[PDB]
């Protein structure tokens, strides 16, 4: 006989077992792990959804730009990036009319954020782009490079520590003609402008703070909208899906027909125009102080005039059209006049993963425009929005007008730049649908981030790794919900991995690595066997009931008294950590910080408070410590004298 697993869907419906359709748990080998040409395809497709003769040569970069906003209305059903300005502003104003002054409370929270924000909130993130080296670097590295190259010039405002001063430095930097980078000698103002707006795959170094501010505003907005369930994770989305169902279907005197669409917007992220974002931010910043509008308006202007980083690409300017194939020849033909100095020009673009929450704000606006008060008709809709995968429920008294409401949704979406995908979208009746890998069929299953964790060890310690494993199991049991038997199997898999990684199997099995002899002698001299740690060759009694207790305290009652007295002794030479804490074997800022921490232990726990310089505090602390361990403690007077002579040497040195 021949085997077919998908046929199983004949006995059991799909939503009961849709996890089988998900092939991979982790990540497959990315086909585009390299590639400079598909980016050209993205550029040309973005400029194809915007070809309406709105070309303007930039005044300061000379790069041609398209301005398809509020351009000609589309005549075709294909994806079009033409959104009328008045439509966007009217939708935003109607959202504000549905929720009074919500934008102002969000702006107040955003002002509190921009007041308190230091530069550390610029380090919490993935890899960034350093323009100094025209290369991708980690966050703090590119940040320190930018700080040092700014300190080399006359830009030292970020010394206060507030991110707004770093933004002021960024603003002052674009105005200078010469840019000397540290024998090194580097580019002028124009190339600096080109690099400052350059994006990769990955924002520039300057724009990250401004995008953080815009996203904090969008967060304060989306938190106060029930129909936007993006910032939350897990069961919250469950509740936000289980509520709207009763918000739509439960209509008394039932003549209403409730249909539900699971939709998607094809290439929507490339259709969101930064100038429309400038407009919607400007309307959100209505009657607020001008400086705040100026702060928040930085990022959309940078994306209106932004450059895209692509044999190098820089030599694509001087070449004859014979060395390429026909398809690549055509793809390069349509990009030659757009690129400048090895950098591509992309006016109407927006990169995936930048304004997802503000885009969700816009989507929720075009969603709330259907609460039968702004439609002025019979049909009325409501739905849940994500970045691109949205779900809608439209209720209409008859099956004749439901398509009319769907048409209203799609037309208004086209009007705000939301190109609904006629392929990756399907309608059905209310009670079964999809929203960002969440599936609803009269019930729930939460396979959204169901990419179960690294079953193996996390690799930092013996107790820290075990606690990490069991804690992540419990978290995925409550946060990214998994079944209990799967939790048992994953736990024993991790225990196997943790036993084979640390050469600690048990003192009950005969298999012997480079270590098992001492473990088995330990087992032999122990009376009550159950108390032994897994690191010390002990039984695993971790189960669902005790997935939260650290290993030591659970076995703490069942240990032997000598075992306890020998295990936790802090006068040892090596969550809860004990003498079995390995600390395995593995320069400007961290050096100073570590010396400071050695001077003040509290500096490693609580953020210190003090207006004096680092050196002024360190010298006084050293002198007082010398005094106290000389008088009451025991130290030679000559060592004290040398300490204080070096301290006075620093006193004379910090003055020059």
């Amino acid at each position: 006989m021949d085997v077919n697993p998908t046929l199983l869907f004949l006995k059991v419906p799909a939503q009961n077992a849709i996890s089988t359709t998900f092939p991979y748990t982790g990540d497959p080998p990315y086909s585009h792990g390299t590639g400079t040409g598909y980016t050209m395809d993205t550029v040309n497709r973005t400029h194809q959804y915007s070809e309406k003769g709105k070309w303007t040569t930039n005044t300061e970069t000379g790069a041609p730009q398209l301005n398809p906003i509020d351009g000609p209305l589309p005549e075709d059903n294909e994806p079009s990036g033409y959104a009328q300005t008045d439509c966007v502003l009217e939708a935003m104003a109607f959202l504000e009319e549905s929720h009074p002054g919500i934008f102002e409370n969000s702006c107040l929270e955003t002002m509190e954020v921009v007041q308190q924000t230091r530069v550390d909130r610029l380090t919490q993130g993935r890899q960034t782009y350093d323009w100094t080296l025209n290369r991708n670097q980690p966050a703090a590295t590119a940040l320190a490079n930018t700080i040092e190259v700014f300190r080399s010039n006359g830009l030292t405002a970020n010394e206060s520590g507030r991110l707004i001063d770093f933004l002021k430095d960024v603003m002052e930097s674009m105005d200078k003609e010469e840019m000397e980078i540290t024998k090194k000698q580097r580019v002028n103002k124009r190339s600096y402008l080109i690099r400052a707006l350059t994006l990769n795959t990955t924002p520039g170094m300057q724009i990250r703070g401004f995008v953080y501010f815009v996203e904090t505003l969008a967060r304060s907005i989306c938190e106060k909208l029930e129909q936007s369930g993006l910032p939350v994770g897990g069961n919250e989305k469950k509740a936000k899906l289980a509520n709207v169902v009763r918000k739509m279907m439960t209509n008394s005197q039932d003549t209403e027909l409730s249909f539900t669409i699971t939709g998607d917007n094809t290439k929507w992220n490339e259709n969101q125009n930064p100038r429309m974002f400038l407009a919607m931010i400007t309307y959100i910043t209505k009657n607020q102080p001008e400086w705040f509008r100026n702060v928040l308006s930085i990022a959309p202007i940078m994306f209106s005039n932004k450059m895209a980083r692509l044999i190098p690409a820089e030599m694509l300017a001087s070449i004859d059209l014979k060395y390429f194939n026909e398809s690549t020849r055509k793809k390069i033909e349509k990009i030659r006049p757009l690129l400048i100095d090895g950098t591509a020009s992309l006016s109407p673009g927006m990169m995936m993963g930048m304004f997802n929450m503000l885009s969700t704000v816009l989507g929720v606006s075009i969603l709330n425009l259907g609460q039968k008060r702004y439609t002025k008709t019979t049909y009325w809709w409501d739905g849940l929005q994500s970045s691109d995968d949205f779900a809608l429920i439209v209720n209409a008294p008859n099956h004749e007008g439901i398509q009319a409401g769907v048409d209203r949704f799609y037309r208004t979406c086209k009007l705000v730049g939301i190109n609904m995908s006629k392929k990756k979208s399907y309608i059905n009746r209310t009670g079964t649908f999809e929203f960002t890998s969440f599936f609803y069929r009269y019930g729930f299953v939460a396979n959204f981030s169901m990419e179960l964790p690294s079953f193996g060890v996390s690799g930092i310690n013996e107790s820290a790794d075990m606690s990490i494993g069991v804690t992540v199991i419990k978290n995925n049991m409550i946060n990214n919900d998994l079944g209990p038997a799967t939790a048992q199997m994953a736990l024993q898999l991790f225990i196997k991995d943790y036993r084979y990684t640390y050469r600690c199997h048990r003192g009950d099995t005969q298999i012997q690595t480079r270590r098992s002899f001492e473990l088995k002698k330990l087992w032999e001299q122990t009376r009550s066997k159950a108390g032994l740690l897994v690191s010390d060759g002990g039984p695993n009694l971790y189960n669902i009931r005790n997935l939260h207790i650290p290993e030591v305290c659970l076995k703490w009652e069942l240990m032997d008294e000598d075992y306890q007295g020998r295990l936790c002794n802090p006068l040892n030479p090596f969550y809860d950590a004990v003498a079995t804490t390995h600390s395995w074997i593995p320069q400007m800022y961290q050096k100073c910080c570590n010396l400071f921490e050695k001077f003040f232990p509290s500096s490693s726990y609580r953020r210190p408070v003090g207006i004096s310089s680092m050196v002024e505090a360190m010298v006084s602390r050293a002198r007082i410590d010398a005094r106290i361990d000389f008088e009451s403690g025991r130290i030679k007077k000559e060592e004290f004298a040398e300490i204080m002579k070096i301290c006075s040497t620093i006193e004379e040195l910090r003055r020059q």
Binding site: L108, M111, E112, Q115, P289
Partner: protein, 52 residues
């Protein structure tokens, strides 16, 4: 900022600064630093004048 200012001060100085801020259209929601400075000014004057 605002809640902390309302925390470390008596409601009388808070009321005084709140009324004194409605004088020149200086909205207290924006000029919170002016709020803190004025509350500081008033408490300094009071603890300066007390018990003399």
């Amino acid at each position: 900022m605002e809640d902390f200012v309302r925390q470390c001060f008596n409601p009388m100085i808070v009321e005084l600064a709140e009324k004194a801020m409605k004088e020149y259209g200086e909205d207290l929601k924006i000029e919170t630093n002016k709020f803190a400075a004025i509350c500081t000014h008033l408490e300094v004057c009071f603890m300066y004048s007390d018990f003399h």
